[PDB]
Design a protein around this ligand. Structure first.
Ligand SMILES: COP(=O)(O)[C@@](O)(c1ccccc1)c1sc(CCOP(=O)(O)OP(=O)(O)O)c(C)[n+]1Cc1cnc(C)nc1N
Ligand SMILES: COP(=O)(O)[C@@](O)(c1ccccc1)c1sc(CCOP(=O)(O)OP(=O)(O)O)c(C)[n+]1Cc1cnc(C)nc1N
Ligand SMILES: COP(=O)(O)[C@@](O)(c1ccccc1)c1sc(CCOP(=O)(O)OP(=O)(O)O)c(C)[n+]1Cc1cnc(C)nc1N
Ligand SMILES: [Ca+2]
Ligand SMILES: [Ca+2]
Ligand SMILES: [Ca+2]
Lengths: 524, 524, 524
């Protein structure tokens, strides 16, 4: 067998059947004789390739496979890799290298010092020392991406390797099963359970690894048994809990003082599947107030190490959430009362308040819709106004890197063909990965894109306001016609200048057979 | 509080009470006002500092704390760090940096690009962005070293940081408990146990992480229940099993073909706490023969990823070995028969055969002796001839880096004051870290050093023989007087030119109140 | 031809005929059939290998070639590489890698992420993608080490590469001539010369790259023409000027304030072949005082970039010093007056003052002696008391990394067989690379080693004194018998407890036919 044949066999035996890519000459020997059981998803720029693959992996809860062109293709994807690192996305990033005979002279398209290029944004990064090693290196990449804590990995392959003879002993790679589905030992788990049972006023904080593990239902059971309020950890990349469940208390503000104040009076705070904590704004104060102790369950040693407070347990989130939910006592305390419905913001017949947009989406979207958020100034309102009952219903750029939601919404929609994906994206954010629209059109992936157009980088205006910063350049983005951009890439386009038009546009979009972009005129 | 006071409080609260070091000016502000409850162990070169700390950590089964001088001190220790990486040794390596005001100009003793210096031999490597961050960074270092898979970490600290005010919120660091004591979920553990119960001819292979976890006794129970032969994985850094137990089958040869042949006919091979596998020599063949399947339990994702065959489970070795030992059925198969005693090699009244030396050590040493091996050509014979009943009885340079055993034997002896340490070290190997002898003399750490003097790099002569390599330079090391070297560093010195003298020297050494070096004239 | 044959041909055609090494199995296929026209110099530990090669390269003013064993051998040498980086030493460091077929599994002796290991201490670091690339990669290593600014480089070679067929087109590598012998363009050089001619009170500061370039005599001419005082830049790795020439003003103190004070009143300060500046102690103040402007000629862009003051020209030191010396006007100002002779320190019949030792060395050593300094507390006195008339007469660890002078003195003596090398090394410093003594004995390289024994890390006691630091551990090194250490490694050993014995010992050492170590009892 060839390295080509052996590698594709390894991929299929490990459950991989799709290649997300933007092709180049170093990759042609890999892509030739493309197997008939595989699918190739083209995107026009590598931030888009990786964003699509990322959405697909996060929603499918399985690794996604990417093929990029040498250093320039890899480089174009590095902002996207920053998000993937923070979301623990299992991405296998491969990049084609020059033929081994031309690496020394640094021919055009040589990826120099290749394994160093994507660092520090990957778990593992490698170029094999010989062609016959390629299948083994691919095996390493698959498992490194897939083991807890999941994350992106990088493999560089000289293009002449594919046609070489594979090692017959590579067959041992095909069916390897590698598990990190582990939980705390019985003795120490019993200690933890007793601490939860004994708490007088417990609180629960959940992060994105809960949703990645599909541990949501177990966390609901856990919260119900403990009669505990549930918050989502700050800067949330995913939604780990039904947002209208009586225990739900919403998204935590991303500040040190804000969080310790919120947790004041809670004697035991159990954090599951989150860093402690993904703060954002400067908000100095106490990490925790006197009387509060924190216990973190995390899949990631790097998270456990850097928490400034609390105890930690490094284990699989699925296994731990299931064990805790099934072991804790039913508390005799009263179940928390549901948060009241949000207020309706006054809305005239002109430009849309973001609150109006979210209320209308909530009214009209199916109960199993999936939302993506890259409308950076409206996140708090979005979290309050969308009833998200089901797992896998929310995605937000985990490293704050713009250019995620537009392509990721396409990957999510590909992963979940029966759940309507609705990406709510600011006019600024929409540009970073605008060319991803083409992939939705070409493959008829029926994502709905809602562009919140207020003509400015709104979140930056706000942060500048709090800093009291005068004379900041580059904050306005006037003069972008999003309907024309959509037309450019073959996506049906609608405009909503007021509420009547918003409802009409959403009705049309929800009824459409392909992707649709709606440009919404929102208040400055 | 100062950063100095806060950092020492964090260290003591996390169980650290000893600093292994070689001092410099960048470290003086850390070492001043050295706490009265701490101990400082000086060594004369940094390979020795780290080797001593490494032996101490491995034997104590807890992190060891190291303080080195900037780039040159760190650099001198990098061979030692290569071993520590392979043995999963929890080492907290700190190095002093220039004052922040002088880093930019690259004053003498500036550690340039400091965090990159020890890579790729550390789990985590960092320089804090401010003085107040130092305690938090130290906390990260402690936990990164200590979490499975354990390993060395690196922290660079500008010398002006120590006198600065600490953040009062650093108190939250002091008592953090971080656990990675995890095992496979119940459902999948039951599947594994059933596979072991159902095996017709199981075999067990154990690596160094078994001994690190003190999982030895649990592995004995497991082997007895399964009635299974037990091998030690190749290139063994530690001894994970009583070497005269009936199930014991010895050290595996470090070759692909050799190992698959050894495992032929075994239907299920369970590997615990080892890489799969630390091969050494070129010995191409089948990874496993038809009819053998392999299951690996490893604490290290990097090991699970790179295994060329078998299934893997990434979990704590202590927790997994205990669970398996207590869950498996008692097989009705006959218990394996003990290996017969080794043959006595013919020995005249002249120079000593290594076999004679090991037989004599076995005869005379206490039953709870601890051995170290850096006699590279005699390893197979050592493993056959020393009855090692207890855990923590054997150490060998885990990355093959010479200069480990001499200093490590001092650290081990410090960790285990009631167990006689005997380091068996070749004449070539003895030189790499010769100055470590001084630390044994100064602190009166009563390690026995047995120098196997055959005048040559024996293992290299052998590898050259198999390669059929003629005219290789640099293989001989004549003209070293090890008694004079011992005298140089204040260690009592004896010479054994024959068996009568060997017995006499060992009797004197075992009766001595301090460290002793015995130079043994061994056969070429 | 084989890769082996082609690589040795490239080496010899590029002027390399010596391999400094400590061998291992990954290197045996390189070292086998060792060419009869090459020499191999064995040392017992890799810090010693690299130190010897470094002294050899610095004294010979040509690249030195090193062969180390994988990661552990490379790691043991990294402190030595820190010095080599700072001295711009042209060192070609090669290390053997596992066979390509065993790299993936990370067999014992695999150098993982090899090219990253020696960073940031090398100019270039690489592992070739194929065997046939090895000669080209070696060519790159030779030229990268040799081009200004010279420095160490690293090449990792899988051991199976050597026996493979070379590319016949590799012959084009053999005779490549690569020059960086460049100087400032005529127009701008004329501007510089006019600025020097017009200066009313110029000063000259010289660094190690002057001595490396053998630009010393040209700098003498330059200083004589400009009638300018000449200082050596601080933390001096080499001596760039005759120390009894009337213009000579000695070693600059390594402090910001000290240097600006020294330069006060000098209108133009010309720095040649030094960083601006290698400060050491904290000594805050003005970089330059009003009225002083600085112009730096440096071979190293990294030096030019980081200078906090002055203009800079990046060019070859030899070419620039020659051009300036031959272009400047003869000033009509009076030639500076020679510094007066140092005072004789009162000396009783007991332990030796360092000043006495240096005076006696100056009295007895030949006029073409070469000194090395690793007696860290006595440097200022050494510089004042040794008349060094000739180039290449002084070496001091350029990064402050101890363990340099003992091995480097052996390499220097090998490079300069007709110039008596005398290494003056503190009792603390002597231990770092003590095993290097063996190489001097084995090859009968007649270096004289003068051990300044005061029982303590003297420089650290002084820095602790100025910091007012109490209770610092690890500052004393009692109980080392240096005569016994010398005997251990086969070097003739003498002791000097007083002046009478010092003179007697030096007379014997200077008359000896081999290496000699003198242990001198110096004042605490
Ligand atoms: C033979 O094509 P290659 O050697 O692969 C290619 O790299 C290249 C680069 C420079 C000169 C000629 C070809 C080019 S050329 C190429 C096609 C560009 O199509 P375009 O329609 O612009 O022009 P044309 O080829 O039809 O005239 C692609 C996608 N690539 C790979 C590639 C992918 N993603 C990124 C960021 N950079 C890249 N270079
Ligand atoms: C066949 O020998 P190798 O595979 O090359 C070797 O690496 C090794 C390592 C572990 C087990 C067996 C051999 C060893 S063994 C070896 C000889 C040691 O001589 P010694 O006199 O100590 O014992 P013996 O061989 O005579 O019994 C050397 C120099 N090397 C290479 C080496 C050089 N410098 C440093 C820092 N570490 C190293 N390992
Ligand atoms: C004030 O001392 P420092 O600034 O710390 C020091 O780095 C130094 C370097 C160059 C010139 C002056 C001092 C030196 S000087 C010093 C003492 C050496 O003692 P030695 O007995 O050799 O001479 P002396 O000081 O008594 O005359 C030490 C241990 N250090 C730190 C150090 C530790 N380990 C290694 C590999 N390299 C180092 N430089
Ligand atoms: Ca906007
Ligand atoms: Ca030997
Ligand atoms: Ca001293």
């Amino acid at each position: 067998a060839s390295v080509h044949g052996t590698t594709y066999e390894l991929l299929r035996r490990q459950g991989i059947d799709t290649v997300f890519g933007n092709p180049g000459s170093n990759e042609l020997p890999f892509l030739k004789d493309f197997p008939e059981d595989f699918r190739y998803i083209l995107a026009l720029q590598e931030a888009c390739v990786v964003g699509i693959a990322d959405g697909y992996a996060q929603a499918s809860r399985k690794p996604a496979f990417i093929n990029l062109h040498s250093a320039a293709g890899t480089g174009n994807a590095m902002g996207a890799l920053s998000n993937a690192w923070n979301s623990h996305s299992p991405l296998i990033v491969t990049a084609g290298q020059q033929t081994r005979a031309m690496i020394g002279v640094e021919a055009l398209l040589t990826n120099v010092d290749a394994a160093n290029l994507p660092r520090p944004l990957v778990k593992w990064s490698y170029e094999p020392a010989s062609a016959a090693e390629v299948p083994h290196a691919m095996s390493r990449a698959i498992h490194m991406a897939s083991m807890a804590p999941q994350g992106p990995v990088y493999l560089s392959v000289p293009y002449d390797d594919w046609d070489k003879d594979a090692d017959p002993q590579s067959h041992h790679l095909f069916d390897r099963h590698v598990s990190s589905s582990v939980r705390l030992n019985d003795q120490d788990l019993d200690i933890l359970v007793k601490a939860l049972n004994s708490a007088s006023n417990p609180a629960i904080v959940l992060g994105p690894d809960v949703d990645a593990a599909n541990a949501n239902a177990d966390c609901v059971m856990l919260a119900e048994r403990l009669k505990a309020p549930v918050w989502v950890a700050p800067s949330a990349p995913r939604c780990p809990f039904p947002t209208r469940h009586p225990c739900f208390r919403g998204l935590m503000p991303a500040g040190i003082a804000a969080i310790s104040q919120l947790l004041e009076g809670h004697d035991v705070v159990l954090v599951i599947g989150a860093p402690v904590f993904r703060y954002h704004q400067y908000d100095p104060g106490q990490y925790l107030k006197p009387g509060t102790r924190l216990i973190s369950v995390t899949c990631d040693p790097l998270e456990a190490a850097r928490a400034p407070m609390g105890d930690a347990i490094v284990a699989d989130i699925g296994a731990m959430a299931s064990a805790l939910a099934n072991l804790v006592e039913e508390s005799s305390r009263q179940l928390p009362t549901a948060a009241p419905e949000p207020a309706k913001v006054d809305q005239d017949a002109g430009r849309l308040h973001p609150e109006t947009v979210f209320d209308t989406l909530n009214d009209m979207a199916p109960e199993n819709a999936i939302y993506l958020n890259e409308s950076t100034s409206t996140t708090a309102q979005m979290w309050q106004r969308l009833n998200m009952r089901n797992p896998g219903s929310y995605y937000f750029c985990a490293a704050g890197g713009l250019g995620f939601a537009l392509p990721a919404a396409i990957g999510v929609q590909l992963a979940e063909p029966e759940r309507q994906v609705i990406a709510v994206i600011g006019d600024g954010s929409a540009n970073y990965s605008i060319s991803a629209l083409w992939t939705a059109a070409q493959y008829n992936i029926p994502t709905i894109f809602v562009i919140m157009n207020n003509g400015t980088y709104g979140a930056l205006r706000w942060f500048a306001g709090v800093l009291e910063a005068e004379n900041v350049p580059g904050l306005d983005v006037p003069g972008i016609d999003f309907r024309a951009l959509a037309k450019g890439y073959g996506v049906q386009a609608l405009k909503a200048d007021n509420l009547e038009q918003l409802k009409g546009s959403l009705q049309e979009a929800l009824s459409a057979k392909g992707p649709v972009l709606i440009e919404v005129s929102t208040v400055s």
